RNA sequence: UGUUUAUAGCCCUUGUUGUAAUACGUCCACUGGGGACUGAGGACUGCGGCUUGCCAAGGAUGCUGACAUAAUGGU
């Protein structure tokens, strides 16, 4: 099959059960809101 | 000074509004937030929920950025 296999039987990680679910933003950050930038260049 | 709701009212008992409210106690296998520390394990098995796939259910993954530097780290 492949060429130059590693001399170590690879350790596959255990199947994680972390499912990505949609972020629930703050109830006060509706579109059209005026906001204040705290960090960054602005 | 003396009296008995009058041109203020109060105290006691009962009825009512009443299945009154609140406080306190207790409980919810009811629920909304904010912060902190930790991520041990390493294919598959298990117990469960959902609808075979999915799942927060036998231990962290995902999306990114900066720097790739003495920056982290050590002496």
From Swiss-Prot:
Compartments where found: Cytoplasm; Nucleus; Nucleus, Nucleolus
Quaternary structure annotation from Swiss-Prot or TrEMBL: Component of the large ribosomal subunit (LSU). Mature yeast ribosomes consist of a small (40S) and a large (60S) subunit. The 40S small subunit contains 1 molecule of ribosomal RNA (18S rRNA) and at least 33 different proteins. The large 60S subunit contains 3 rRNA molecules (25S, 5.8S and 5S rRNA) and at least 46 different proteins.
Function, as annotated: Component of the ribosome, a large ribonucleoprotein complex responsible for the synthesis of proteins in the cell. The small ribosomal subunit (SSU) binds messenger RNAs (mRNAs) and translates the encoded message by selecting cognate aminoacyl-transfer RNA (tRNA) molecules. The large subunit (LSU) contains the ribosomal catalytic site termed the peptidyl transferase center (PTC), which catalyzes the formation of peptide bonds, thereby polymerizing the amino acids delivered by tRNAs into a polypeptide chain.
Entry's family note: Belongs to the eukaryotic ribosomal protein eL6 family.
Name recorded for this polypeptide: Large ribosomal subunit protein eL6
Source species: Schizosaccharomyces pombe (strain 972 / ATCC 24843)
């Amino acid at each position: 099959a492949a060429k130059y296999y590693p001399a170590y039987r690879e350790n596959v990680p255990k199947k994680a059960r972390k499912a990505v679910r949609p972020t629930k933003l703050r109830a006060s950050l509706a579109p059209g809101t005026v906001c204040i930038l705290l960090a960054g260049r602005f």
